[PDB]
Write a protein that binds this ligand. Structure first.
Ligand code: NA
Ligand code: NA
Length: 205
């Protein structure tokens, strides 16, 4: 059989996710007819990676975030939102979204983490981000490569886009993940494992 993934980053939260065999919900669509449908720089259907954002909002729900975004889409919109219960895709991943400024937008799928308020719901939200991201990497034939420390790859934080590409100055998701005793590198390891499970290279949970 296939080898179990050896975690490359210690994570008691990822251990919890795996041990309890958490299952991500289905990706559901909530598209909006008036959002623009613009190409990535290499074409429609040509994303180069995916960005981790968080809503920076301790009070909102995923429904409130989506309501706000549909009203303010000319200022910002993203591809999807995840929380502890749902994965909602709000724009097709084949077209760009307005989520990470003028340099990153023509390159990357943008996904927002909605804030959660207990341990189990936070863990699920991480599992859900990672499932969605691994799914996109697989579908588009991208392999996980973290850009955090070298400015190159297919998985980016908003912070990394601000640091290496410019066009924006946000610092998500580091502070938010830290507040829940997690980190971007633990998330990345979870994306990597899930990608490898989907690609049939390591054992499913
Ligand atoms: Na898609
Ligand atoms: Na890299």
């Amino acid at each position: 059989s296939l080898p179990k993934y050896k975690p490359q980053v210690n994570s008691s939260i990822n251990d919890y996710i795996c041990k309890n065999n958490l299952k991500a919900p289905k990706i559901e669509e909530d598209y909006t007819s008036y959002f623009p449908k613009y190409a990535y720089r290499n074409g429609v259907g040509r994303p180069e990676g995916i960005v981790v954002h968080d809503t920076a909002n301790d009070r909102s729900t995923i429904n409130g975030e989506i309501s706000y975004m549909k009203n303010n889409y000319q200022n910002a919109f993203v591809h999807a939102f995840v929380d502890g219960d749902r994965i909602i895709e709000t724009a097709p991943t084949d077209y760009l979204s307005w989520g990470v400024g003028a340099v990153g937008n023509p390159r990357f799928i943008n996904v927002e983490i909605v804030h959660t308020h207990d341990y189990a719901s936070f863990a699920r939200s991480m599992n859900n981000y990672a499932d969605y991201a691994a799914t996109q990497l697989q579908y588009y034939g991208l392999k996980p490569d973290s850009a955090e420390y070298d400015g190159n790859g297919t998985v980016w934080t908003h912070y990394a886009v601000s640091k290496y590409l410019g066009g924006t100055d946000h610092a998500d998701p580091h502070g938010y993940l830290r507040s829940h005793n997690y980190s971007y590198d633990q998330l990345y390891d979870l994306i990597n494992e899930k990608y490898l499970i989907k690609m049939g290279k390591v054992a499913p949970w």
